[PDB]
Amino acid sequence: ATLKDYLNKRVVIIKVDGECLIASLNGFDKNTNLFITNVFNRISKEFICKAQLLRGSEIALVGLI
Amino acid sequence: RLETRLIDALLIAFQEQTNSDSIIFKGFGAVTVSLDIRMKPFLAPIVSTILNHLKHKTPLVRQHAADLCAILIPVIKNCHEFEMLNKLNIILYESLGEVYPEVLGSIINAMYCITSVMDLDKLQPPINQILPTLTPILRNKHRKVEVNTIKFVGLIGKLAPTYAPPKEWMRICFELLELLKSTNKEIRRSANATFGFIAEAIGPHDVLVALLNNLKVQERQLRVCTAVAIGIVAKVCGPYNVLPVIMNEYTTPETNVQNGVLKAMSFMFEYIGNMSKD
Amino acid sequence: PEILPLEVIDKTINQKVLIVLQSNREFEGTLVGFDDFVNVILEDAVEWLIDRNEKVMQHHGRMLLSGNNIAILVPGG
Amino acid sequence: TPLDLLKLNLDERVYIKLRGARTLVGTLQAFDSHCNIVLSDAVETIYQLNNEELSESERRCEMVFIRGDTVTLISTP
Amino acid sequence: MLPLYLLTNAKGQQMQIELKNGEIIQGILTNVDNWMNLTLSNVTEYSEESAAVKLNEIYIRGTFIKFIKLQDNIIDK
Amino acid sequence: VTTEFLSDIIGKTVNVKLASGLLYSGRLESIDGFMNVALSSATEHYESNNNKLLNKFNSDVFLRGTQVMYISEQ
Amino acid sequence: AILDLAKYKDSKIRVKLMGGKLVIGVLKGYDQLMNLVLDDTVEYMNARKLGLTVIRGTILVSLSSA
Amino acid sequence: MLFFSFFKTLVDQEVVVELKNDIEIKGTLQSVDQFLNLKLDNISCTDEKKYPHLGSVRNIFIRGSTVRYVYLNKNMVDTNLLQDATRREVMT
């Protein structure tokens, strides 16, 4: 099990609270802590951050788009 | 009020004793037997001090901790504190690899008191895990251990024969057959009684061949104490099972077998009293 | 001159303690014992739910309260 | 020990209560110390409270793995 | 690079932490540990993102962080 | 000290509360360092034993340790 | 540790807990596990007055000054 | 270690995953980890309503802590293997 194949690619992230993100995955640590670039709200298409760190406690699913 | 003050006086006078003497135990045990059902409330804190003294360094105090369990057991069953009975039993099981033979003997004695009284199914370790821990203890030499063990092993032969598999009972029948070299008597006597308990369990013919192979041996106690056991295996499992195996063994040309087969026949005709006619 | 939390809890042994969970619920009783993980033994606990507060139950004997859910310990209730 | 007395009823019918008014009834195939379970021939009952009223839903599966962290209780139905 | 390394080298930069309860903490990072516990100086905490308390120093437990917005400067810094 | 308790009440009648409020009353056959509990002749009640009996298990009940709030004697 | 609690001894601290509790007290003691000893402890839920309290570090979420 | 072993023998087998937040995903199990994290290839929708906001996405990583259910077929699992393995496992 590894998010290795996703590095530097665009990804969909579904949070546990059912929230949705779109971003470039640049780093990942062990807990599914993500380092993300150009993050957006999938539903909202609203730009969230140029660079962001997202805790794995929040993640439910990460998809390779 | 005196019933409460008397027991506080004894516990104290019990727990400062220095010299080893019977008087405290018989005394504290002649009180319990009299008032037994009335003892229930006083029985909680007493058992706490037994469990406290079985952790104590000086080996005398671990004798008297275990010596006073063997007295309270027949009180406790009346009380019904079976969980404690299973609490004492486990604690006596985890201590059963002690060094001091004087102390290890008396722990087995308390184990023997708990076992007889309690429901066979209930015992915690339980029995099928206990008995294989004893078989290496029969080889402990000394005596207090040999005696108190042989009485514990024979207890299981009566009460729960079906637990250890029969190859385990045969491991004991050899360890006993070597053990009746002992100089003591009560050992030799209890060792012979537990062949009856094993012969009832597993079968006579597996056991006899172990015994009759031992009549070749020179030393006299061994030939007489096998000749008794063949008498005991005869009574318990029936003489028709034993007798043609003994009448065959009589043919062997060595003389010591031929007396040992005649002496075995003496014993077996006084143990089956009236039968004998057949 | 450092004050250690566990030493504070050690001192409150044999005294009245309030134990407040991370939820509303609380346990007030006599502090019998506690471990390194802050599991707690109470004697004759009053179990409460907090806001009108309804007293859930009155324990008799000894309760082991899992330290997993304990947020606060108050010495002498 | 309680985790060993669970092996006792492997291949035997089991009832599992889960977080969120879920119930599972199945034959016990596999389990670990995390409480993680595998049940065969299972039915899952869900109690939902919608429009102020109580309904219970159902879901059948021939083989199901259950993340052990939601597991609250394990017995026989 | 790993999230943690990224944090460890953002030391002295400004960042915005969103907690599990909705509180937002804007501050300058002063320290990070292996469990992502933070200490920040020049802090402003908000009850929610809608927005305002000014604090000199704040400690945040890492298990309580939903995300940490970094300064766009991050990649080169 | 907590361990001494765990072995002190085995075979006694206990109430085991979970996070949810549900309470289980039974005889405690077994316990583990993870707080996992085994009970026999167990009933479930919500918050107080005096409240409505929700279930009576003739069989043995395994309560998960991560979920237990207390195990207490009566 | 990343936060030096020594500089906070005998000062008033604000401690947010897991499950949404607030606690302001005077810092008397601490451990490596973040267990605290507060004095004049006020727990905000609006106001409740405990005295000398021990706060569990495992549930501690945030810690600022007061 | 046991359930990791279980999930390894399921590689190349279609499974349905139900996450705690009421999301359902059908897919081919491409990979498994020690915490039972899953990588699913060729993603598809089992339920109309429960299914989340995807589309082109055909390959996903699912965090094991977030799963409630993994739905299988009785032929994907040897029961007696599972039983004897559970019996073997020690929990202390």
Written account of the structure:
This is part of a larger assembly, with eight protein chains of eight kinds. Chain B is an all-alpha fold. Chain B is about 70% helix and about 0% strand. Chain B has helices at about 1-15, 25-35, 45-55, 60-65, 70-80, 80-95, 100-115, 125-135, 145-160, 165-175, 185-200, 205-210, 220-235, 240-250, 255-270. Chain C is mainly beta and about 80 residues long. Chain C has a single domain, classed as SH3 type barrels (Roll). In chain C, strands 1, 2, 3, 4, 5 and 6 form a six-stranded antiparallel sheet that branches. Chain C starts with a helix and ends with a strand. Chain H has about 90 residues and is of the alpha+beta class. Chain H is about 20% helix and about 35% strand. In chain H, strands 4-3-2-1-5 form a five-stranded antiparallel sheet. Classes of the chains: A mainly beta (about 60), B mainly alpha (about 280), C mainly beta (about 80), D mainly beta (about 80), E mainly beta (about 80), F mainly beta (about 70), G mainly beta (about 70), H alpha+beta (about 90). The interface of D and H includes residues 4 and 36 of D. Chain B: Contacts pre-mRNA on both sides of the branch site early in spliceosome assembly. Chain B: This is U2 snRNP component HSH155.
Give a short synopsis of this structure.
The structure is cut from a larger assembly and holds eight protein chains of eight kinds. Chain C is mostly beta strands.
- Count up the domains of chain E: 1
Radius of gyration of chain E: 12 Å
The outline of chain E comes out as globular
> Secondary-structure element order of chain B, as H and E?
HHHHHHHHHHHHHHH
The CATH topology of chain E comes to: SH3 type barrels
Determine the fraction of residues in helical runs of chain E and give it as a percent range.
under 10%
Could you give the order of strands across the largest sheet of chain E?
A: 4-3-2-1-5
Q: Which band does the percent of strand residues of chain E land in? A: over 45%
Enumerate how many helices of chain B there are, as a single number: 15
Q: Report the strand count of chain E.
A: 5
Q: What percentage of amino acids of chain B are in beta strands?
A: under 5%
Tally of DSSP β-strands of chain B? 0
GO cellular component, one term (chain A): cytoplasm
Family (chain A): Belongs to the snRNP Sm proteins family.
Protein name (chain A): LSM2-LSM8 complex subunit LSM8
GO molecular function (chain A): mRNA binding
